[PDB]
Amino acid sequence: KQVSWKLVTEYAMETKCDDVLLLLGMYLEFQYSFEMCLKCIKKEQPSHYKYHEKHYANAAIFADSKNQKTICQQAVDTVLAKKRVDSLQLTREQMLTNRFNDLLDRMDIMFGSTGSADIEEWMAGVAWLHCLLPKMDSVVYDFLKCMVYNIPKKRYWLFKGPIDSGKTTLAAALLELCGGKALNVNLPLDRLNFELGVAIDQFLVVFEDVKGTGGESRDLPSGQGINNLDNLRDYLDGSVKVNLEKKHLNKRTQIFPPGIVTMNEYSVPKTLQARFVKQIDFRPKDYLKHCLERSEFLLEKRIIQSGIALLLMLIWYRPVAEFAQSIQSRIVEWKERLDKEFSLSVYQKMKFNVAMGIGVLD
Amino acid sequence: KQVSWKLVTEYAMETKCDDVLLLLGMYLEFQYSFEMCLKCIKKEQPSHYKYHEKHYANAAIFADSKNQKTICQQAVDTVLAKKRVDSLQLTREQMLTNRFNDLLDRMDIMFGSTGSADIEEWMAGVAWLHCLLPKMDSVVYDFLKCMVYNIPKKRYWLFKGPIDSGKTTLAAALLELCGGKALNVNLPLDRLNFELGVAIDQFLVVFEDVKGTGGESRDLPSGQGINNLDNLRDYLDGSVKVNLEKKHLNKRTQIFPPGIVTMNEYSVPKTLQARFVKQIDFRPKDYLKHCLERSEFLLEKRIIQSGIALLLMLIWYRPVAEFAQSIQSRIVEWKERLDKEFSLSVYQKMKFNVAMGIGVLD
Amino acid sequence: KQVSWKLVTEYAMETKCDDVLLLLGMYLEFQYSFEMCLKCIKKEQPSHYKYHEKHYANAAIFADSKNQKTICQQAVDTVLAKKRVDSLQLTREQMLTNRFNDLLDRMDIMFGSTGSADIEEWMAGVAWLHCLLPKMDSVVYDFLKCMVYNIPKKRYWLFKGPIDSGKTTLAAALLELCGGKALNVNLPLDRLNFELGVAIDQFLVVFEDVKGTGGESRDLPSGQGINNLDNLRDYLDGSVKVNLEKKHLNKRTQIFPPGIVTMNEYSVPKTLQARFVKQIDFRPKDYLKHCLERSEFLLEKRIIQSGIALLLMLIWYRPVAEFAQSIQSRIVEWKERLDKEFSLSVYQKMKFNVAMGIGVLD
Amino acid sequence: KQVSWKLVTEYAMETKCDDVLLLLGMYLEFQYSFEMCLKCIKKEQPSHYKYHEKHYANAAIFADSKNQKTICQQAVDTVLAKKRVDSLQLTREQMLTNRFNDLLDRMDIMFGSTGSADIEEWMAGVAWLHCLLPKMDSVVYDFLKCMVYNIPKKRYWLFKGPIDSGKTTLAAALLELCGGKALNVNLPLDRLNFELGVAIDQFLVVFEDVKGTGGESRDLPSGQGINNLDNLRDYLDGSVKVNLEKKHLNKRTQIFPPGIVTMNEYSVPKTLQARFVKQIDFRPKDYLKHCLERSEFLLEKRIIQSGIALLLMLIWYRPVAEFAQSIQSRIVEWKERLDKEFSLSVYQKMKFNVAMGIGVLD
Amino acid sequence: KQVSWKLVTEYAMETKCDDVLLLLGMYLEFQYSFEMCLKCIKKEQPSHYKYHEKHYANAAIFADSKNQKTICQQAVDTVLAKKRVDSLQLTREQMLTNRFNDLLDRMDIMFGSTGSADIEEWMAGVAWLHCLLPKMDSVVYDFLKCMVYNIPKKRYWLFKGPIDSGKTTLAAALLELCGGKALNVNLPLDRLNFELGVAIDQFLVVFEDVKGTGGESRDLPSGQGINNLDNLRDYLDGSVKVNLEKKHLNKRTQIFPPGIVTMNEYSVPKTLQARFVKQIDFRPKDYLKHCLERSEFLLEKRIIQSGIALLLMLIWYRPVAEFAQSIQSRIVEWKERLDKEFSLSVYQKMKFNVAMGIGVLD
DNA sequence: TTTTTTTT
Numbered sequence A, B, C, D, E: 001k002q003v004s005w006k007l008v009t010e011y012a013m014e015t016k017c018d019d020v021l022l023l024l025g026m027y028l029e030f031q032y033s034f035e036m037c038l039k040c041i042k043k044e045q046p047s048h049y050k051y052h053e054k055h056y057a058n059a060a061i062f063a064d065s066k067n068q069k070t071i072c073q074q075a076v077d078t079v080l081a082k083k084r085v086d087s088l089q090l091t092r093e094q095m096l097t098n099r100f101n102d103l104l105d106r107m108d109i110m111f112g113s114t115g116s117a118d119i120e121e122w123m124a125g126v127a128w129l130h131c132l133l134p135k136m137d138s139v140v141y142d143f144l145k146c147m148v149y150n151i152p153k154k155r156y157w158l159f160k161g162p163i164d165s166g167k168t169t170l171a172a173a174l175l176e177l178c179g180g181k182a183l184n185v186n187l188p189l190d191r192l193n194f195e196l197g198v199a200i201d202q203f204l205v206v207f208e209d210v211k212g213t214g215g216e217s218r219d220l221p222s223g224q225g226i227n228n229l230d231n232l233r234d235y236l237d238g239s240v241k242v243n244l245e246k247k248h249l250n251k252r253t254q255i256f257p258p259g260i261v262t263m264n265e266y267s268v269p270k271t272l273q274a275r276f277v278k279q280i281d282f283r284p285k286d287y288l289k290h291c292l293e294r295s296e297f298l299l300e301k302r303i304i305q306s307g308i309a310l311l312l313m314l315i316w317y318r319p320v321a322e323f324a325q326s327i328q329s330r331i332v333e334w335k336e337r338l339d340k341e342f343s344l345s346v347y348q349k350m351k352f353n354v355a356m357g358i359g360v361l362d
Numbered sequence F: 001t002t003t004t005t006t007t008t
């Protein structure tokens, strides 16, 4: 009998795998009898144990094929093709709705019975982040809607304040939530053309730590990047399409994606100040620092970095109506979980602890 | 049975598709039983719902093929082959006529039953455009004739004015109208080689915001652009063929397309000035700004960037006689539709509101 | 009859071989009659004499094959696929356990019947290393655990001391034990970006011989290393992912590995100082250089640079329960072997010889 | 009836051919009958006439094949695979053993029954070489052992001497004997890195007359060598692995091979002095040049840069016991020829003619 | 029935054709019936008419095959393979002897019944060129032998003089006579580094206007000749071999070919001067110009550029015994046919017309 | 494999 290339393509679709070697390696594991597969028995990896029993029969025949890499390439192409279609057709709401479904699937596993994570420790993260800025949950919801509508000029946000004020911590969580890339515009003017190539097909971008100049009078080290951004007007305004370049590839034309800019207290030209919708000032606070000392599991597990943390904040704080209609059904079930898991006094007491600078838990 | 490679080629032809991945993805959509196809039922994409029912049977057999990417490669080459045949055998007038027929097809959707656009909003955009320069519609018509005739050493128009005077706005609409590419000349002398490669087989090009030198007397930056263009004379002149380059690919040879140059008020070599046919000055105007502040749905929907808007302006203003004979029938039909939906007084009222800096739609 | 590709795939897996030529060459050796095979009789290479008999028949048929290289390419892909899967799914603690099993296999060879090394000479190396810093074994155990947990901010160790004070030596041994790469960051600021591409998918890095500035007052030749690091805080803190560049390749995004920093006695910014978990001071000591000078077989055999010496040290000093569960069996066997091969007085004397600076062995 | 691919593969192993074109060209010769093959009859080339009569029938069918280069590519892969195996499994002593057998095999034909050379000619070369520097054979034997043992630090000798000292001429013959390369450290230190990858996999290496980087102080043109090697220590001392690079290619790590520094008499830093076991400084000598001027034969056959002469120098002087154990028989089997045919007085006569600068032969 | 690939391969060997497009073009001509072939009847090209009848049958079937370029590729490889076998194995004299046979076979045709040129005009060319410098035939005989023996240092000669010195005229004729290749030395070296790959497998190479600062006294620009060659002294010496570039094929290790350098009478370093074991100075004379002016077929038919003219000159002047041995029957055959047709007095009077600047004919 | 990117 013969290999079903179809069953491989279904697995590649369902795992969303798009490295040929990873696809190859995964599929080969299934050739042993799932009935005794230790990975199955220990429930170690969903992409294995959910699928081993189904694909076992075909994996055995695949193991005898002489065409193995060809089968994988065709499968992987199917996954890549689906992404091209989606990018050229989905609405930005649907894109975001997909991204949330992916995160919610991880949370189902992660706070599942097999899952490692402690929902309490992750809720401690939410209390800390909600403390980082006034009206934090509203600020997130505003940012998200701004990215979805992607209204020209009204597109870009500025994070400003001294080193160790958490701005990159928040940027990373947002970037994890939406998907996107960091970029570094401090380069000399030539290499920028490949930097910007990273933006190709992304949903967000984040500009790291753009060094101004003259602020070294206040110990802020001088750099080029502010002048470069001052010269990247159309990329920021997003009004017309632009051409983007990768190594060994011909240029590609699209609307440059929206995003975030982060900096120390350099002085900003009014030309550039005009382009940001919103400036958010970050400032350091001792009680957060003292709390972190006592609450170190937050850092150890990277909780405060994680888009998973922000999604819990949204689920906790914001009305069911605000979420895209299809996932509202899942959202209700998560609100129901959290309501069972915490009384509001539990949550409030945590926030109080953080404000005291005491360890979050008591 | 076997896959019909012919039917796939037909689908590629009729969608004018020329990405192998997009084609593959699209064709695989059809493999599911047509009758339940939610994309069909919700009438989401004509590129799908027109074709699914027809292609379904062959799509199922295609889904089993071990050879899928080779089948798609042949179809994509057929679409590319037709483009090259046409590029070597059409008149410049015919090319523009075909391009216009395409925009007119897109307009059927925008204002059709699916009707996602509002024709009143898009007609508001035309009012703002007809304010941007004296005799705007006459200027557009003169440029179109210039591009069709393609008279050697009389092929290029110069736009200059302050920043925020409107240059790239108007270039963007002309470029969508005719089809073409933007190019950046502010580069080191090596990178120009691959950069100018982009012009291959295009109808227009636009050289974007060419930087001069000594412009700091006007608080401009300075850069390569002007001294660099002063070398590239024969590309402007278009009297003789030239040899054009792509990455990993051999030099093509053709006449370099006609086009537009944009800049701020750098001072220009009189030699380069003599190579331009026509210079158009742009100036900021307060009432356009105040009108825009009160009319921002123009920006939000990119109306004033869009080639559809320039086509609508021509249909409103120009005699049917000026249109190429084949499309005069469609032009007459669109004129009747516009005359039905708008009085002159309504259009006059809009234009008067713009002159007063009011929101257009009172 | 026909070639079994499966048998070649097994050999490639069992030998963990990932060069197509290395694989091809060795498999061809099996075609000659194993029953006489001088390599087998002289028990020279395990990867041969363990396998020759088993694979013999298939190797003979493979010797006739008309497509040999395609077989070997498929086999090598299978080995590479296993690495990709493991890279993405193992815990760091399992990676180290695997890294240990590999070395224990090679030790079973070195000190086995083939006897190509003397365990007593290697134990001399252990004693000399143990005297290089107080509580050396506890120091090494702490270092390994630190790399295994990879707790953010708590990630980097600093080695200071005069030249020829062993800091390179110990780093080399640790790197041989764990796997990883060195890096040089005394470069100018631009080319650092390609340098840091080295770290992609490594377990450790060593920033080797960072030049400071102004140390040249103590004849420490000055350079940009220190100031480059003081920019790189985000990579060191390890709290969020970063983008790494390779030549002719796209960026790739990951957590930046933990590592070690070595320098002569330059000054440090307090900012940089705060990023280190622990500082270790190296001082040159006369009895060590004199003992080396009278025990030079150590150097000649490159013993003291070798991770095998570190593994022997851990086994000698540290409890079985402290090792990962699976390998505790091999640990027990090796303890028993070493205990039988060395009474304490032997080791005590060897240490005391080092203490006297005389040749270790007298 | 069909081409045996195996017979072609044997011939490739037999010849050790590793160029697909050479293999193809030669094997096609065998299609004519060996019975009148004039190359066979005139005994022109062994790699033909030794094999034609065996391979004849297969070569006829080979000449009718349609796949000819495909057969030959597989055969070249076999020989390259063989090298890859040996290059990784053996140690330096067996490598040298095989290396000597190769040159001994050649001498066993050059002075063989063809008479196509007379060893007498080479003995004049041997005399000139033994006059070149004292105790010459022992200096070679010491260097050979030194480069075999590759003991750390003790890895480099410095040649020194002005133009026409012969230091290049010597290094050439040693590289002929060993295999290895020379390297231009006087390259500018940023580009220099892309040459260092030449050292990959090399048994032995040489540094080309390392220029004082302020060397023109001695009226010797300056170059980066001494600046670089003042710094780049353990590439020479070979204690630990270091990393090396090529243009458009990856880095690779190795122990940097042992070798020879050469210099014209530039200023040398103490760092760079410490690298050397030996710092042999030597002169152009007048009778030597006058000898060659009267002993032109030695240059006419390039003898004084051929390692074949060094092998003969060792064969004459060195005891049989000093050589690799099995080939000691071949050492006897040469000493029989030399010590028969040339008296030590005849040998001393040649050395004396050299010492007098007289034409070596009378 | 089917194409004989063997018969095609014979034609490629017969023609010594080694371009796959040329070969394909050639063979397809034969598909028409040779019996009426105009080219045959016209006796237009020997490469055709000698072969059309023989190959017609096979060409007819070749014309229908669906893989014609595969046949031609294998055939072309057979020709390239033959060259590689000869390249390594032949004596330099034997190579030169083959080259002469080829030229003599053309002279059979040129002065044959085809009679497409007259040895009258060519002998006028001989007479003209025998004026270019004293005893020209004898000077060439030295250059040939210097090249055949290829003795180290004794491998390069320098032509010197003004412009219009004929030095390129002489270089051209020698390169044709040998079948060498050409190179320009005067580049900034890292361009030339890859270009030098051309030198692979060549009997001879030549360098045009080896120049430098030694002519900027006369304000003639410093081409990097004198810059490069004092470094590249080894390549002129030819004492030792080196590795050389190609696209696609592996780098090839060879000695450099011996060759020629030329200059427009710049200075030379004495270090470099030593490599020009001859140097010869050339200066214009007006009567030679007037002769050309009155003998213009000398230039129009390129006679005075052509190696054929040198071969004619050597046949006239040199003794039969001075040639390579086996061709001397052909040497005698042409020496007869020459003096059979020319009295010395006519040849001498031709030379006297040249010396007078009279048109050679009478 | 080159090429474009590296490399400069």
Ligand SMILES: Nc1ncnc2c1ncn2[C@@H]1O[C@H](COP(=O)(O)OP(=O)(O)OP(=O)(O)O)[C@@H](O)[C@H]1O
Binding pocket: A132, A161, A162, A163, A164, A165, A166, A167, A168, A169, A170, A209, A283, A284, A285, A286, A288, A289, A292
């Ligand atoms: N608001 C805050 N007040 C005090 N400490 C803070 C605050 N935010 C962050 N921290 C501390 O600073 C550390 C680093 O935070 P983060 O990386 O986000 O700072 P940053 O100022 O945005 O950095 P950078 O500008 O270098 O990207 C945190 O791990 C935490 O210990």
Ligand SMILES: Nc1ncnc2c1ncn2[C@@H]1O[C@H](COP(=O)(O)OP(=O)(O)OP(=O)(O)O)[C@@H](O)[C@H]1O
Binding pocket: A239, B161, B162, B163, B164, B165, B166, B167, B168, B169, B170, B209, B262, B263, B264, B282, B283, B284, B285, B286, B288, B289, B292
């Ligand atoms: N003539 C104008 N008067 C007032 N506002 C204008 C005018 N033209 C453009 N604007 C405003 O400025 C924005 C920028 O327009 P655009 O980017 O085309 O102008 P530009 O700065 O002159 O062009 P470019 O970037 O090509 O040099 C417009 O979107 C509109 O909001």
Ligand SMILES: Nc1ncnc2c1ncn2[C@@H]1O[C@H](COP(=O)(O)OP(=O)(O)OP(=O)(O)O)[C@@H](O)[C@H]1O
Binding pocket: C132, C161, C162, C163, C164, C165, C166, C167, C168, C169, C170, C209, C263, C264, C282, C283, C284, C285, C286, C288, C289, C292, D239
């Ligand atoms: N503690 C020590 N006391 C004396 N000699 C030492 C000591 N440690 C190392 N050595 C000697 O120094 C040599 C070099 O060691 P190593 O490279 O590890 O030193 P280092 O301090 O890291 O030097 P550098 O920074 O100059 O590379 C060793 O091979 C040994 O000969």
Ligand SMILES: Nc1ncnc2c1ncn2[C@@H]1O[C@H](COP(=O)(O)OP(=O)(O)OP(=O)(O)O)[C@@H](O)[C@H]1O
Binding pocket: D132, D161, D162, D163, D164, D165, D166, D167, D168, D169, D170, D209, D264, D283, D284, D285, D286, D288, D289, D292
């Ligand atoms: N000891 C010697 N006595 C006399 N002549 C010598 C001696 N050694 C070399 N020569 C002459 O010098 C020529 C160049 O030799 P070689 O390249 O080996 O010298 P080198 O000292 O390495 O020079 P450089 O520093 O210029 O590279 C030889 O071909 C030979 O003619």
Ligand SMILES: Nc1ncnc2c1ncn2[C@@H]1O[C@H](COP(=O)(O)OP(=O)(O)OP(=O)(O)O)[C@@H](O)[C@H]1O
Binding pocket: E132, E162, E163, E164, E165, E166, E167, E168, E169, E170, E209, E263, E264, E283, E284, E285, E286, E288, E289, E292
């Ligand atoms: N001996 C000569 N007397 C007079 N004119 C000569 C002589 N030799 C050559 N010429 C003239 O010089 C012209 C060019 O010759 P050639 O190219 O060989 O010169 P060249 O010195 O090598 O030149 P360049 O340095 O420019 O390449 C010839 O066509 C001829 O007209």
